[PDB]
Design an enzyme around this catalytic site. Structure first.
Site, PDB file in Angstrom:
ATOM      1  CD  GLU A  35      -3.162  -0.780   0.073  1.00 49.99           C
ATOM      2  OE1 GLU A  35      -3.158   0.336  -0.463  1.00 49.99           O
ATOM      3  OE2 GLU A  35      -3.940  -1.677  -0.256  1.00 49.99           O
ATOM      4  CB  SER A  50     -11.940   9.375  -1.908  1.00 48.97           C
ATOM      5  OG  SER A  50     -11.601   8.275  -2.739  1.00 48.97           O
TER       6      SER A  50
END
Ligand SMILES: [Cl-]
Ligand SMILES: [Cl-]
Ligand SMILES: [Cl-]
EC number: 3.2.1.17
Length: 129
Positions: A35, A50
């Site tokens: 990530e 977002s």
């Protein structure tokens, strides 16, 4: 802060993630590696407007408030900037709510595509835990 592999494993362990909802520690290390590359300051913007924040790339559409994601929820009740800190406490506490939601670690796309079904124990090999 950019964590080393073992340093992060130990921080995660101390904050109660080892076997949290059945996911061994190596799952959490593997997710953080893909990530964020273990960088607490990582941010990435999504097509929908977002943004994902921190070591676990927690998304501003549901989980935190960044003041620029219209009609979003703030289910972890925290500013998204708190997720970028060198102290992983806030990220960890929010991750525990995410993984409890129904989809377990499948909420993390990089976990599902790169960690799931692999030998995740390799991520903690060599570490003093
Ligand atoms: Cl493991
Ligand atoms: Cl939000
Ligand atoms: Cl699950």
């Amino acid at each position: 802060k950019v964590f080393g592999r073992c340093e992060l494993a130990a921080a995660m362990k101390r904050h109660g993630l080892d076997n949290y909802r059945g996911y061994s520690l190596g799952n959490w290390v593997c997710a953080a590696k893909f990530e964020s590359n273990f960088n607490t300051q990582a941010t990435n913007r999504n097509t929908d407007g977002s943004t994902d924040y921190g070591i676990l790339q927690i998304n501003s559409r549901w989980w935190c408030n960044d003041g620029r994601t219209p009609g979003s929820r703030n289910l972890c009740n925290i500013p998204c900037s708190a997720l970028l800190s060198s102290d992983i406490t806030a990220s960890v506490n929010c991750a525990k709510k995410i993984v409890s939601d129904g989809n377990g670690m499948n909420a993390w796309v990089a976990w599902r595509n790169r960690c799931k079904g692999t030998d995740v124990q390799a991520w903690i090999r060599g570490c003093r835990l």
